[PDB]
């Protein structure tokens, strides 16, 4: 019986998944995707490419309606009619949207054709994750839609410049993406929510802080950690939480509106908020660690180099620049790494970098790699520790 075989496959893979850790589950999930692609028929391939698109659009609709937030807090299954009436949606439209969502696990459909939250419902109700889905829809999809014709009309150039990539066609502007976004209020607002999502795990799970510090001393008034473009300051918060008695200043640097949004959730003491544009010379001199997490991936080499060159003059011999970012392998890179690469190429003109490419970029700033501490698998994120050459 097919039904019996399929249910047995689900039972065994669930049991294997439960018994491993997050990294093993990620490896199982990638293997299931690989199996799906290897076993699908030719028309399956076309249907999946034709339709998987639609999930982002329907998630955006559900977010517009407040559906996921609402279903996440309901105590009993809801009919489509109840949901349509509550959320202000046409009843037939609501019913068709809910059936589609149930088929892709965005909600769950009961045996009496009512609706309850799934894992994905709960995810899409979390503000920062909702904001990620909304960002994919309004910022990533237009640049991906523009890329094929952008490349064709330009005879397939190597993209190297933030002011000359698919973004400019997609949004009919000569501005680079970051400059243009900062002129668009609703888009800015969605980004500020996006910063509230903290990734797990983080570099402190494998970073040997004591070993890296050695005998370093914080007197007088030296900084232990300068978080450059630190956003809500999650790295500063976690560092103070794990090492509450390490001396040295811990400093969150970002632009004033971001530091303003961070104040609500910062500890009342132990972390300084310091407005600072990372395209300008670094004000804190001789800090132990200058930390750049998910910063330099967003810039082509020329601009990423300029960001590093604003920091290096502030370093002393004990200073390190810690780049915490993706470090895809030389071969066999996974879909999240390469898909990121194609997206940031299209929007920002930038690229993912292997270890060798990070080293080549850093050497242009007069830095050499001392240590690399990976903390996620199988997609590689690592804290790369650089010193002056």
Ligand X SMILES: C[S@@+](CC[C@H](N)C(=O)[O-])C[C@H]1O[C@@H](n2cnc3c(N)ncnc32)[C@H](O)[C@@H]1O
Ligand Y SMILES: C[C@@H]1C=C[C@@H]2CCC[C@H](C)[C@H]2[C@]12C(=O)NC=C(c1ccccc1)C2=O
| 165 near ligand Y, judged by CB under 6 A | no
Residue nearer to Na ion on the CB measure, 72 or 309? 72
From the list 282, 294, 306, the residue with the least C-alpha distance to 361 is 306
Residue nearer to a copy of itself on the CB measure, 208 or 335? 335
| 232 near ligand Y, judged by CB under 6 A | no
**Choices 19-27, 208-216, 288-296, 343-351 (CB under 6 A): range interacting with ligand X:** 288-296
| Shortest distance (Å) from residue 104 CB to ligand X | 24
| Shortest distance (Å) from residue 354 CB to Na ion | 9
301-309 helix and 355-363 helix, angle to the nearest 10 degrees: 60
Binding-residue pattern over the window 297 to 336 for ligand Y, x denoting contact by CB under 6 A: xx--------------------------------------
Q: What is the distance in angstroms between the CA of the first residue and the CA of the last residue of the chain?
A: 66
**Choices 25-33, 61-69, 104-112, 224-232 (CB under 6 A): range interacting with ligand X:** 224-232
| 234 near ligand X, judged by CB under 6 A | yes
| Shortest distance (Å) from residue 167 CB to ligand X | 16
| 128 near Na ion, judged by CB under 5 A | no
Residue nearer to ligand X on the CB measure, 181 or 372? 181
| 240 near ligand X, judged by CB under 6 A | no
| 74 near a copy of itself, judged by CB under 8 A | no
347 binds, among Cl ion, Na ion, ligand Y, none (CB under 5 to 8 A by kind): ligand Y
| 200 near ligand Y, judged by CB under 6 A | no
**Choices 107-115, 218-226, 274-282, 376-384 (CB under 6 A): range interacting with ligand X:** 274-282
The whole-angstrom separation of Cα 251 and Cα 162 is 29
**Token pair 């995810």 in the structure block, residue:** 123
Options 114, 135, 163, 192; binder of Na ion; rule CB under 5 A: 114
CA-to-CA separations, 5 to 8, 9, 10, 197, in angstroms, rounded: 5, 6, 9, 39
| 131 near ligand Y, judged by CB under 6 A | no
Residue nearer to Cl ion on the CB measure, 158 or 330? 330
CB 283 within 8 A of CB 261: no
| Shortest distance (Å) from residue 120 CB to Cl ion | 9
The whole-angstrom separation of Cα 336 and Cα 380 is 10
| 112 near Na ion, judged by CB under 5 A | yes
Name the site residues for ligand X (rule: CB under 6 A). Answer: 195, 229-231, 234-235, 254-255, 258, 277-279, 293-295
């Amino acid at each position: 019986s097919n039904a019996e075989t399929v249910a047995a496959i689900k039972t065994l893979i669930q049991q294997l998944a439960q018994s491993t850790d997050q990294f093993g589950r990620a490896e199982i999930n990638d293997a299931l995707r690989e199996l799906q692609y290897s076993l699908e028929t030719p028309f399956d391939t076309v249907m999946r490419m034709s339709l998987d698109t639609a999930q982002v659009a329907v998630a955006r609709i559900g977010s517009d309606l407040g559906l996921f937030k609402h279903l996440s807090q309901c105590a009993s299954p809801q009919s489509a009619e109840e949901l349509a009436d509550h959320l202000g949606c046409g009843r037939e439209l609501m019913s068709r949207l809910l059936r589609y969502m149930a088929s892709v696990r965005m909600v769950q459909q009961t045996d009496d054709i009512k609706y309850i939250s799934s894992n994905i419902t709960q995810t899409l109700a979390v503000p920062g994750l909702e904001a990620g889905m909304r960002h994919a829809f309004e910022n990533l999809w237009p640049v991906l839609m523009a890329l094929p014709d952008f490349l064709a009309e330009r005879k397939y150039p190597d993209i190297v410049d933030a002011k000359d990539t698919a973004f400019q066609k997609a949004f009919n502007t000569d501005q680079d993406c970051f400059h243009w976004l900062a002129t668009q209020p609703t888009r800015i607002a969605n980004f500020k929510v996006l910063l509230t999502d903290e990734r797990t795990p983080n570099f402190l799970s494998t970073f040997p802080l004591e070993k890296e510090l050695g005998s370093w001393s914080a007197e007088p008034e030296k900084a232990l950690f300068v978080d450059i473009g630190g956003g809500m300051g999650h790295a500063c918060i976690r560092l103070r939480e794990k090492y509450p008695n390490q001396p040295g200043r811990v400093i969150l640097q970002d632009l004033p509106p971001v530091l303003q949004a961070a104040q609500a959730t910062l500890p009342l003491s132990g972390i300084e908020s310091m407005p600072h544009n990372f395209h300008t010379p670094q004000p804190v001199q001789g800090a132990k660690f200058y930390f750049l997490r998910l910063i330099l991936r967003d810039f082509p080499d020329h601009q990423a180099l300029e960001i590093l060159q604003n920091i290096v003059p502030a370093m002393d011999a004990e200073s390190r620049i810690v780049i915490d970012d993706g470090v895809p392998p030389e071969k066999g890179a996974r879909w999240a790494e390469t898909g990121t690469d194609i997206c940031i190429m299209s929007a920002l003109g930038s690229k993912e970098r292997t270890q060798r490419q990070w080293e080549e970029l850093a050497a242009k700033a007069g830095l050499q790699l001392q240590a690399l501490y990976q903390y996620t698998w199988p997609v590689v994120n690592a804290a790369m520790v650089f010193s002056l050459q």
